[PDB]
Amino acid sequence: SLPPAIFLMGPTAAGKTDLAMALADALPCELISVDSALIYRGMDIGTAKPSRELLARYPHRLIDIRDPAESYSAAEFRADALAAMAKATARGRIPLLVGGTMLYYKALLEGLPYTVAQLAIAPEQRQVLHARIAQRFRQMLEQGFIAEVEALHARSDLHAGLPSIRAVGYRQVWDYLDGKLSYAEMTERGIIATRQLAKRQFTWLRSWSHLHWMDSLAGDNLPRALRYLKTVSILA
Secondary structure (H helix, E strand, C coil): CCCCCEEEEECCCCCCCHEEEEHHCCCEEEHHHHHHCEEEEECCCEEEEEHHHHHCCCCCCCCCCCCCCCCCCCHHHHHHHHHHHHHHCCCCCCEEEEEEEEHHHHHHCCCCCEEEEEEEEECCHHHHHHHHHHHHHHHHHHHHHHHHHHHHCCCCCCCCCCHHCCCCCCCHHHHHHHHCHHHHHHHHHHHHHHHHHHHHHHHHHHCCCCEEEEECCCCCHHHHHHHHHHCCCCCC
C-alpha cells in the first residue's frame, strides 16, 4: 500500500492556492510548492507569491529557498520534493503539491512510491483567465513590482540572462529599467509573456492523463476534491 499524495496543478492565475488552503483545513496536509519562480527570495510581487501572513498560517515547502543569483534544476526539485514528501508522510501528513511548473511534476512522475490524486483547476473559458492575467499584472505594478526588480537590477552579481529573471514579467520590467521600453510596452509585453506561459501550461495539461478538473469559478471544489480521493482509492 502506497502512502497518499495530492497534486494540485493549473495555469498561472487559476486560483490554486485558494483550493490548497481549503484542502489543508479539511485534511492534515503538507503544502509543497511546485514553481520554478517561487523558490526565489526577493521575488514576491511579480511572482504572485502568497503573502507572508498567508504563508505563516499555511506553510509551503520549497518557497524562498534560493537567492536570485542561484540556479535550480528539475533534478534538484525532484530530490527536494521527494525528501519533503517523505518527511510529511513520516508525520502522517498528506503531501499536497501545488503549482504550475509542469516540467517539475513530470520529473517527479517520471525521471513515485505514492498513491497520487491529481487535480487541475482553471476557468471553463480561457478568456476569463486572460482578463485576470492582465488585471493582475497591472496591479503588480501598482503594488511595487518595479521597486522589487529595481533591487535585483542594482546587483552586480545578477544580469538579465539568469534563470531567475526568466520568471514571467521580470525581463520586461528589467528592460524598462534599462531604458529600452516605455511603461506601456513593458506592461503589454509582460501581460503577453504571462498569457504565453498559461498557453504553454494548458498544452502540458491537455495531454496529462489521470487529471480531475476543477472550475476556478465554482464554490464547491472542496467537496468535489475530497470525493475524488475516494475515486483514486485513498481513504482519508
